[PDB]
């Protein structure tokens, strides 16, 4: 359901403008127990929004978490190589 995740993606980022840490942890939780696809990571760049929750997040729990989510990325990307060596993109130290 695209039009579900869509939706989990736009309260994820409710969770990240009201900055609700408890929230986005327990959204975090609940993807964890929901399986995604590499091309649902695609078409809804989930990661971001869990990125932005990072850099407004200082607890470590939730930024090992979101690196663990990455991981799991480049795990089903299947090729962790070209994503660590990553330079054929620019990449910005923000996003606005």
């Known amino acids: 359901m695209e039009d579900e995740v869509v939706r989990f993606a736009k309260k ?20 964890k127990n ?3 696809t590499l091309e649902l990571l695609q078409s809804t760049r989930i990661g971001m929004s869990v990125n932005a929750i990072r850099k407004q997040s200082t607890d470590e729990e939730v930024t090992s978490l979101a690196k663990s989510l990455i991981k799991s990325w480049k ?3 299947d090729g962790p190589s070209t ?3 990553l330079d054929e993109k620019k990449k910005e130290p923000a996003i606005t």
Do not use: C, F, S, T
């Open 34 to 36: 929901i399986p995604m």
């Open 75 to 77: 795990k089903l990307l």
């Open 83 to 85: 994503e660590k060596d």
């Open 12 to 31: 994820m980022d409710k969770m990240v403008q009201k900055k609700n840490a408890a929230g986005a942890l327990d959204l975090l939780k609940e993807l």
